[PDB]
Design a protein around this ligand. Structure first.
Ligand SMILES: O=P(O)(O)O[C@H]1[C@H](OP(=O)(O)O)[C@@H](OP(=O)(O)O)[C@H](OP(=O)(O)O)[C@@H](OP(=O)(O)O)[C@H]1OP(=O)(O)O
Ligand SMILES: [Cl-]
Ligand SMILES: [F-]
Ligand SMILES: [F-]
Ligand SMILES: [F-]
Ligand SMILES: [F-]
Ligand SMILES: [F-]
Ligand SMILES: [F-]
Ligand SMILES: [F-]
Ligand SMILES: [F-]
Ligand SMILES: [F-]
Ligand SMILES: [F-]
Ligand SMILES: [Mg+2]
Ligand SMILES: [Mg+2]
Ligand SMILES: [Mg+2]
Ligand SMILES: [Mg+2]
Length: 132
């Protein structure tokens, strides 16, 4: 795990959209609580570029690849002490049997943006804000 100078854990994530119209986004199930949804993402490795970490974590957690788009922003979770670079990713490859599917049975699902914001709100309000 890696950290900013203030001790916040460094993370990266993508908003994995179905298309360039950015109407449908891919969430993945929580590892702790499989009945809940999150935005896929995770820790940056040492010296790892945030865009590289984002794409790698989406591949591991969600089993997708695509065309990397713009940095949306950098988002803090004060409560959990982490700070997340969030990028747009336009999905072009949907893989079966990806890392977390095989290892922890992680699920994924497409959501209209409105619905994504809805299911994120309760446990992951900072993640809901990614879409603002
Ligand atoms: O507190 P939790 O509900 O168990 O959330 C955990 C935890 O997030 P926190 O940093 O807030 O504790 C993990 O972070 P660490 O404990 O490893 O620092 C995070 O891991 P990543 O930052 O690497 O994403 C993991 O997410 P996941 O295991 O899917 O990678 C996520 O669990 P959820 O899947 O329920 O959000
Ligand atoms: Cl879309
Ligand atoms: F995650
Ligand atoms: F992660
Ligand atoms: F991670
Ligand atoms: F991870
Ligand atoms: F990681
Ligand atoms: F990791
Ligand atoms: F990882
Ligand atoms: F991962
Ligand atoms: F993970
Ligand atoms: F969060
Ligand atoms: Mg991960
Ligand atoms: Mg992780
Ligand atoms: Mg993660
Ligand atoms: Mg990781």
């Amino acid at each position: 795990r890696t950290y900013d100078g203030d001790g916040y854990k460094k993370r990266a994530a993508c908003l994995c959209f179905r298309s360039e119209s950015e109407e449908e986004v891919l969430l993945v199930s929580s590892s702790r609580h499989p009945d809940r949804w999150i935005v896929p993402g995770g820790g940056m490795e040492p010296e790892e570029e945030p865009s590289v970490a984002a794409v790698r974590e989406v591949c591991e957690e969600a089993g997708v690849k695509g065309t990397l788009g713009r940095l949306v922003g950098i988002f803090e979770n004060q409560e959990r002490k982490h700070r997340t670079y969030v990028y747009v990713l336009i999905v072009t490859e949907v893989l079966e049997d990806w890392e977390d599917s095989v290892n922890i049975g992680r699920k994924r699902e497409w959501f209209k943006i409105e619905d994504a914001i809805k299911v994120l709100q309760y446990h992951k309000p900072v993640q809901a804000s990614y879409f603002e």
